[PDB]
Design a protein around this ligand. Structure first.
Ligand SMILES: [Zn+2]
Lengths: 70, 116, 973, 59
DNA sequence: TTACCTCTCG
RNA sequence: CGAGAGGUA
């Protein structure tokens, strides 16, 4: 679609390129969904003590994903 | 664009053009964005990159590359997923930084101002 | 490229039409200009159309409104005259005239007035076949040829083959004779026409013969023919083909046309009208040029090309069109919505169009072709109902005049989808579905069924057989209907009323956004013209209440703001800044907000606490009881500005040295504003004098009588008698204001602002309000605003109930108010009486809806009269509140008085009060003294006039009375 | 139970200024005059003068 | 169909 | 004062 106009890019979502009919993602996302559908999940990884890192742990903690192994 | 000013201020470049800019000299910071029309998260990055441009008018060059058009370059530059930005410095001794994911505007400002 | 993936701009049609006229239209009209020479041979004039230049406007747009000028552009074109005597060439570029320019919003400023051109719908040129049921036996069939000229061509076949033209008033005229007029051999005809035997048994050009491009294409489609498009004539082969079809119908092989379909209608626009006018003007320039050539002969002088041509013909033509044409109208500027809606209007009536009294009932109903193109709900009620309408959101205008509705192709193809726009005719041949794919049984998805349209009908078919799908939420409706929340739950009759009432809302002094909305409020604000948006990117360097400076890449741009200005409808316009200094902006982003707009959205009303219950009769019929809080906290106060203008004891306190009232004066009825010829205040105007303008003028024979204008501002609060309304068709007039202590109150202690009757909903069928009030309460408590698109039940059954009930529960839990959601009776609670402290017996509906204040206010309405000025000829009282006049006792009223038997009362109305000069002057005296009024004997003026008028047509009327006692006859005068 | 279409789509914060350069809005509108001048259909005052003067000199 | 209101334009 | 246009109930 057009290089610059992003109001047109939605059309590609309506008719998707095949490899991305159901795009998957990062391991963090699966955990947040599991908790929402009922269930208990834990995330294992390392994040920095920088600002972005703290934001991510906050999001997960707020969504009730166990963050002890981070 | 004498009477009507262009809406979009970030421009599409090509692999050859990127290479010249890198090998030649520069005096202001370079930010390169890799994107595809298909990715949904990218629609959100575009809006953010256009704001950074208004703020740092000739004190930075923000440029864009499309993966569909230049797939092999992307692989060589080690891009693992779609919303990816490379921040390159005007000094040629310093290392470049690759950021993956949607990241906030303040982080972008901090990298340009402090690290690069 | 636009409108696919987004809602199109609301003014796009005007923008495109203007551009077409500027380039293509101008060139086409210019070409036809004739080279002019006179007598046996004379000097020849050449208008070279190759080089036409349009130049920029001399005055800026704002100045034009301030000095009552017209914003326009100058046309300079090159020409050469070879005087017959000279044999040499002189070339110059003459200033032909001024052509008006449009703002992007789609308005034109002409003589100080914002003007807008409405679109018109008319029947397209082409061949149409109708079967007229015949009074005796078998039915007659006919054909007709609509043309740009408008001449219609008729051909008919009777039970006995007739093939007789009906154009002549006479019954029989021969189509075959017309074919012979074309030089066709009888033999040639036979070879050409199928059904030869039937025709064997049977053994102008200026207007009708021209068919426009649109006319030709239609002909080729209806009777398959393939004469090429450049051809645009009533060539004879066509007439033969028409006859051939005419007989096929008699044998059963044919289609009778529907003339209400939109494939058979065409839309004219700004462009067409403007081009047409340019042509008229151009013919007028030829008349002027020929005349100056003759003048040159008398004076025997060498012409300068400029001398031959004046600028008057172009300017005068447009000045007249804008001023007097039926379809050029002044813009309504009551609110921002009114400005956006006016442009989108479509009319059947107009010049060369239908008249309301004349038009048929069938033209005024919806047709299945209208979907996606013309809104079903909007119409103007009255004798004009069904003939004025509105364009839908996703409509556009095609290459030909036809409209087009977007559709998504679900048929498998490489891409597999594209959005296409379809002509009113093309889509009748595809199956279109508006349902969804959320149904699965033991078979596959492709076998599941859905409702669909095909050939002007509704049917049910499988998902495999569908070709196109309709995907957009707001597609079938106009801007007003698309601003109503929960429309699915309101009967359609109400929706007409509702769209009408939003247009009548008054911009309030402070504005607030709605808690519940539909989401189109955002685009309505962008396209109104009431907001200040950036024209370039940059950073904000200075802000003052008057101006904003934006500094982008070495330039500084100043943007002016509007402070306290009048509108055509006496409403106030004021802009307030939204951007703090030091902030970066991108092009297109908001910088300031206008009236009735907060944060980029349309805001025409306020959110108030309401209960629906009966209260002591104050709410009988449709009346509302309100609290005083609204009056003293200023929720519903509005500013109104009026202008009074002229051409050049205690009273006179205000006047200055020149005698004009000073700025800042408070004036009351009677006070002189500008110094015998004095201008004085009418009744009901009392306000500060915000400004005085002594405007010098040009255009008149004398320097135009300088105009002195005074502008006065009235601040108006809510009062008994005002009309208020909600967005779902609910309207009422205020009946009482009560102190807070006496108002009904909740379990939280708060007192409700308004009380509405609950017997209204069953009769009017609006259940939308109940859903909106309840959601409003929730949002206030939880701090959320909701923007919900229409038709939510597509996702699931009872979707709206699930949203409202869930949200009410969350509010109840988070802020611990258990009354907000009551499990036994959800949405209703128990409230108490302010006067006595006792609980009302049954549970009641409480909520915060959005209520608007309408333009019809009591202050404008009230009028009274005693004595006063009287008219010249009829000698009766004057008409109108402005004119201090009386009220009419008309035919129907007389009849009623007669039924009662009140003769004396009636005589009075006909004599002393109106038109008996001698008698009238006496009654004022009797009353001041205290006497009795005698019964009049002489006739009123009305009668005297009739006699005089008749005596003018040579007839005499006399009144005589014969005395019973002595038999004498006496002639009354 | 819970609604199938999520309610988050509906919610907007009470103190929000809309961004018109966002994914669901049409491209920014252009002033008619500027557009017409960019494409050459209407010419500037200086240009008429320049053309007019040269023509006068030629005559 | 009645009544009511505002405006512009020669 | 004669036309035109937009409303209201
Ligand atoms: Zn619903």
């Amino acid at each position: 679609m057009h290089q610059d106009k992003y109001s047109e890019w939605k059309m590609l979502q309506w008719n998707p390129p095949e490899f991305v009919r159901a795009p998957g993602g990062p391991p963090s996302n699966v955990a947040i969904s599991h908790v929402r559908l009922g269930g208990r999940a834990a995330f294992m990884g390392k994040v920095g003590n920088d600002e972005f890192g703290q934001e991510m742990v906050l999001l997960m903690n707020k969504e009730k994903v166990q963050t002890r192994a981070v | 664009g004498k009477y009507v000013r262009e809406d979009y201020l970030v421009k599409k470049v090509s692999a050859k053009d990127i290479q010249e800019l890198i090998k030649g000299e520069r005096n202001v910071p370079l930010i390169i964005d890799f994107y595809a029309t298909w990715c949904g998260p990218c629609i959100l990055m575009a809006q953010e990159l256009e704001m950074l441009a208004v703020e740092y008018e000739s004190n930075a060059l923000i440029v864009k590359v499309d993966t569909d058009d230049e797939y092999e370059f992307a692989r060589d530059m080690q891009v693992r997923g779609l919303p990816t930005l490379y921040f390159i410095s005007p000094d040629p001794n310093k290392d470049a930084i690759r950021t993956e994911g949607l990241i906030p505007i303040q982080m972008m400002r901090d990298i340009i101002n402090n690290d690069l | 490229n636009e409108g696919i993936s987004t809602i199109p701009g609301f003014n796009q049609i005007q923008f495109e039409g203007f551009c077409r006229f500027i380039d293509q239209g101008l060139t086409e009209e210019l070409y036809k200009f004739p080279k002019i020479e006179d007598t046996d041979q004379e000097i020849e004039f050449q208008l070279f159309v190759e080089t036409y230049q349009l130049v920029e406007p001399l005055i800026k747009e704002r100045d034009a409104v301030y000095e009552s000028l017209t914003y326009s552009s100058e046309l300079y074109v090159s020409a050469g005259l070879i005087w017959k005597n000279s044999r040499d060439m002189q070339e110059q570029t003459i200033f032909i005239g001024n052509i008006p320019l449009m703002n992007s919003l789609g308005t034109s400023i002409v003589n100080g007035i914002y003007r807008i051109v409405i679109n018109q719908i008319l029947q397209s040129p082409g061949i149409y076949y109708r079967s007229e049921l015949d009074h005796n036996g078998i039915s007659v069939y006919t054909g007709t040829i609509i043309s740009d000229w408008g001449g219609r061509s008729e051909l008919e076949i009777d039970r006995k083959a007739r093939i007789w033209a009906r154009v002549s008033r006479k019954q029989k005229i021969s189509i075959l004779v017309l074919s012979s007029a074309m030089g066709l051999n009888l033999r040639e005809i036979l070879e050409n026409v199928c059904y030869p035997e039937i025709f064997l048994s049977f053994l102008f050009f200026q207007q009708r013969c021209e068919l426009g491009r649109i006319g030709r294409r239609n002909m080729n489609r209806r009777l398959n023919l393939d004469i090429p498009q450049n051809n645009t004539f009533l060539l004879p082969r066509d007439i033969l083909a028409a006859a051939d079809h005419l007989i096929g119908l008699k044998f059963g092989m044919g289609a009778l046309d529907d003339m209400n379909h939109l494939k058979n209608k065409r839309i004219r626009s700004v462009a067409d009208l403007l081009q047409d006018q340019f042509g008229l003007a151009l013919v007028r320039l030829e008349n002027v040029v020929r005349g100056t050539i003759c003048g040159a002969i008398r004076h025997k002088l060498i012409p300068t090309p400029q001398n031959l041509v004046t600028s008057t013909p172009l300017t005068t033509t447009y000045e007249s069109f804008f001023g007097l044409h039926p379809l050029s109208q002044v813009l309504d500027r009551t609110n921002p919505l009114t400005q956006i809606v006016h442009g989108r209007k479509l009319s059947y009536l107009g010049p060369g169009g239908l008249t309301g009294r004349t038009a048929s009932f069938r033209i005024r109903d919806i047709h299945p072709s209208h979907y996606g193109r013309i809104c079903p709900i909007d119409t103007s009620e009255g004798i004009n109902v069904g003939l004025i309408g509105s364009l839908a959101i996703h409509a556009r205008i095609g290459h030909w005049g036809s409209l087009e509705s977007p559709f998504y192709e679900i048929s498998e193809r490489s891409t597999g989808v594209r959005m296409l726009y379809l002509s009113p005719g093309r889509d009748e041949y595809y199956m279109v579905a508006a349902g969804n794919s959320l149904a699965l049984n033991q078979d596959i998805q492709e076998e599941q069924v859905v409702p669909a349209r095909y050939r002007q009908e509704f049917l049910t078919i499988a998902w495999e057989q569908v070709h196109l799908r309709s995907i957009f939420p707001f597609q079938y409706f106009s801007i007003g209907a698309s601003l109503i929340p929960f429309i699915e739950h309101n009967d359609a009759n109400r929706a007409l009323m509702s769209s009408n009432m939003q247009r009548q809302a008054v911009p309030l002094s402070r504005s607030e956004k709605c808690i519940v909305g539909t989401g189109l409020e955002r685009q309505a604000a962008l396209d109104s013209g009431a907001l200040a948006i950036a024209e370039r990117e940059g950073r904000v360097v200075y802000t003052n209440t008057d101006k904003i400076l934006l500094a982008g890449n070495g330039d500084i741009l100043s943007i002016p703001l509007v402070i306290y200005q009048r509108s055509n409808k006496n409403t106030c316009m004021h802009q307030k800044l939204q951007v703090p200094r030091g902030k970066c902006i991108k092009k297109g982003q908001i910088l300031a907000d206008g009236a009735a707009t907060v944060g980029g959205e349309l805001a025409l009303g306020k959110n108030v606490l309401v209960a629906y219950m009966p209260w002591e009769g104050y709410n009988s019929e449709d009346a509302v009881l309100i609290s005083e809080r609204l009056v003293y906290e200023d929720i519903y106060t509005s500013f109104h500005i009026r202008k009074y203008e002229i051409q050049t004891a205690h009273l006179l306190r205000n006047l200055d040295k020149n005698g004009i009232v000073m700025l800042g004066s408070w004036v009351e009825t009677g006070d002189i504003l500008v110094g015998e010829t004095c201008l004085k205040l009418p009744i009901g105007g009392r306000g500060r004098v915000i400004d005085v303008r002594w405007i010098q003028k040009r255009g008149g024979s004398s320097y135009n009588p300088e105009t002195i204008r005074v502008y006065i501002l009235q601040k108006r609060e809510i009062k008994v008698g005002d009309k208020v309304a909600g967005r779902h068709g609910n309207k009422g007039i205020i009946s009482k204001i009560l102190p807070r202590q006496d108002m009904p109150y909740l379990q939280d202690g708060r007192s409700v602002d308004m009380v509405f009757n609950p017997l209204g909903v069953p009769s009017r069928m609006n259940v939308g309000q109940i859903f909106e009030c309840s959601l409003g309460l929730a949002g206030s408590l939880l701090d959320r605003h909701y923007r919900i698109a229409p038709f939510d039940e597509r996702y699931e059954q009872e979707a709206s109930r699930k949203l409202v009930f869930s949200e009410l529960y969350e509010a109840s839990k988070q802020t611990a108010n258990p009354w907000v959601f009551e499990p036994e009776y959800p949405g209703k609670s128990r409230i108490f009486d302010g006067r006595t402290g006792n609980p009302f017996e049954q549970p009641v509906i409480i909520g915060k809806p959005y209520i608007l204040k309408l333009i019809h206010q009591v202050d404008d309405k009230i009028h009274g009269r005693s004595s006063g000025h009287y008219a010249l000829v009829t000698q009766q009282p004057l008409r109108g509140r402005a004119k201090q006049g009386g009220q009419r006792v008309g035919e129907m009223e007389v009849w009623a008085l007669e039924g009662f038997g009140v003769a004396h009362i009636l005589q009075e109305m006909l004599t002393y009060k109106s038109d008996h000069i001698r008698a009238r002057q006496e009654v004022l005296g009797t009353t001041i003294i205290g006497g009795t009024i005698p019964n009049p004997e002489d006739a009123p003026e009305s009668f005297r006039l009739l006699v005089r008028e008749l005596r003018s047509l040579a007839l005499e009327l006399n009144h005589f009375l014969v005395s019973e006692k002595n038999f004498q006859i006496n002639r009354k005068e | 139970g819970d609604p199938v279409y999520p309610t988050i789509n509906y919610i907007q914060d009470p103190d929000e200024v809309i961004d018109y350069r966002g994914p669901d809005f049409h491209e920014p509108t252009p002033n008619m005059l500027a557009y017409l001048k960019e494409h050459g259909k209407i010419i500037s005052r200086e240009e008429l003068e320049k053309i007019l003067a040269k023509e006068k000199t030629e005559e």
